[PDB]
Scaffold this active site. Structure first.
Site, short mmCIF file in Angstrom:
data_model
loop_
_atom_site.label_atom_id
_atom_site.label_comp_id
_atom_site.label_asym_id
_atom_site.label_seq_id
_atom_site.Cartn_x
_atom_site.Cartn_y
_atom_site.Cartn_z
N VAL A 197 3.65 5.12 9.81
CA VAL A 197 3.32 5.23 11.22
C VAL A 197 4.47 5.88 11.97
O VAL A 197 5.63 5.55 11.76
CB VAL A 197 2.93 3.83 11.78
CG1 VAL A 197 2.72 3.85 13.28
CG2 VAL A 197 1.69 3.29 11.07
N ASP B 248 -7.62 -8.97 9.92
CA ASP B 248 -6.14 -8.93 9.85
C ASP B 248 -5.57 -9.22 11.21
O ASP B 248 -4.59 -8.60 11.64
CB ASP B 248 -5.65 -7.58 9.27
CG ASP B 248 -4.21 -7.60 8.79
OD1 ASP B 248 -3.69 -8.71 8.48
OD2 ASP B 248 -3.61 -6.49 8.69
N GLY C 60 3.94 0.67 5.68
CA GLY C 60 3.26 -0.45 5.04
C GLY C 60 2.71 -0.02 3.70
O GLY C 60 3.05 1.06 3.21
C1 LIG Z 1 2.71 0.99 17.22
O1 LIG Z 1 1.64 1.43 18.06
C2 LIG Z 1 0.43 1.68 17.47
C3 LIG Z 1 0.11 1.45 16.14
C4 LIG Z 1 -1.14 1.77 15.63
C5 LIG Z 1 -1.44 1.58 14.16
C6 LIG Z 1 -2.81 1.22 13.63
O2 LIG Z 1 -3.79 1.11 14.52
O3 LIG Z 1 -3.01 1.05 12.44
C7 LIG Z 1 -2.07 2.34 16.49
C8 LIG Z 1 -1.77 2.57 17.82
C9 LIG Z 1 -0.53 2.25 18.32
O4 LIG Z 1 -0.27 2.48 19.64
#
Ligand SMILES: COc1cc(CC(=O)O)ccc1O
Length: 326
Positions: free
Chosen positions: A51, A154, A46
């Site tokens: 991630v 958000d 993003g």
């Molecule tokens: C796609 O799974 C997850 C994505 C995130 C990302 C965020 O909190 O910004 C956190 C924990 C997760 O298990």
């Protein structure tokens, strides 16, 4: 100028707390061991982070690593402080660790893993019961964070991670979250286009927790009516016109008049005159099994221009729509 506004609940939660709780700039980050985590695959990228699915080699458990982009320091401390403040709360993603990434030289937040599926992958195929069930679960997360003096800002399907097999939900991506302080003017450049509340679209800065309730109403409308997204704007301006074609222009003008807001003159040539539509206009043979008088009444009480008039998260949990949920 604009008339001030204040949240009708949890107004003074931060004012009574010590500065340690909400003064994120003064927070000292406790660093973990980056070598405990092995990256497995990139899940997404993003504006502010990358991630990854990873493995915690100390327990052989799956985790998610969010490596922040070197864009800004203030945003990072804020997200960390919010995640630590809300940790262990109902349906809040758990921050497991904070490590320094050796390549980016930026912080990497380590979270519990939920599933490779976001709510956007499931939300258009749920039964009536499952919509009620998961909406109640999202409300638990929202009332908790609001009671803790935090607005998410958000809320959208991508930020709701669901393990449908285990009927578990987590509210993720607290990168836009902020502490609510009565009378504070906030940035309106928050939330994703289709989930932006009218307060953001008319540039009213003294908003509060109720912004998350508009976003939650947009998600509900999309689910019950099988229309994604429900308000399909081409840009932020057309986003308000799409809302006005449903809620009407008279209630929009009453809202801006109440707060002494002046619409951007660009709306003079695009807004027009629209009556309020009855919710039954959106019902058809394909979504009727998801619509009930209780769902429509609940939706009507979330999707209000006046942010002060929307249900709070706790009032929403009391609604008849949830009486069938165990
Ligand atoms: C796609 O799974 C997850 C994505 C995130 C990302 C965020 O909190 O910004 C956190 C924990 C997760 O298990």
């Amino acid at each position: 100028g604009p008339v001030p506004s204040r949240a009708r609940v949890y107004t003074d939660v931060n004012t009574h707390r010590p500065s340690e709780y909400w003064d994120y700039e003064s927070h000292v980050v406790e660093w973990g061991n980056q070598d405990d985590y092995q990256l497995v695959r990139k899940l997404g990228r993003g504006k502010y982070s990358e991630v990854f699915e990873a493995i915690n080699i100390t327990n052989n458990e799956k985790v998610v690593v969010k490596i922040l982009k070197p864009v800004a320091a203030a945003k990072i401390k804020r997200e960390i402080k919010i995640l630590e403040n809300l940790r262990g709360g109902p349906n809040i993603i758990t921050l497991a660790d904070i490590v320094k990434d050796p390549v980016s030289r930026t912080p990497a937040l380590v979270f519990e893993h939920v599933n490779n599926t976001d709510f956007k992958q499931l939300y258009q195929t749920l039964t009536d019961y499952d919509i009620r069930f998961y909406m109640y679960e999202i409300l638990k997360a929202l009332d908790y964070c609001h009671s803790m003096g935090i607005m998410h800002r958000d809320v959208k399907p991508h930020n709701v991670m669901i393990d449908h097999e285990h009927r578990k939900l987590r509210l993720i991506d607290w990168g836009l979250a902020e502490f609510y302080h009565p009378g504070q003017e906030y940035n309106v450049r928050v939330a994703s286009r289709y989930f932006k509340g009218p307060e953001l679209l008319v540039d009213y800065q003294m908003y509060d927790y109720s912004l998350d309730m508009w976003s939650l109403g947009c998600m509900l409308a999309s689910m019950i009516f099988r229309k994604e997204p429900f308000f399909h704007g081409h840009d932020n301006y057309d986003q308000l016109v799409r809302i006005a074609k449903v809620l009407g222009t008279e209630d929009l003008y009453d809202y801006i008049d109440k707060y002494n807001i002046e619409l951007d003159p660009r709306f003079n040539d695009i807004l027009g005159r629209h009556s309020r539509k009855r919710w039954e206009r959106f019902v058809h043979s394909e979504n009727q099994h998801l619509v009930s008088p209780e769902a429509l009444d609940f939706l009507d009480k979330l999707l209000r221009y006046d942010h002060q008039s929307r249900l709070t998260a706790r009032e929403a949990m009391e609604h008849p729509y949830f009486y069938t949920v165990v």
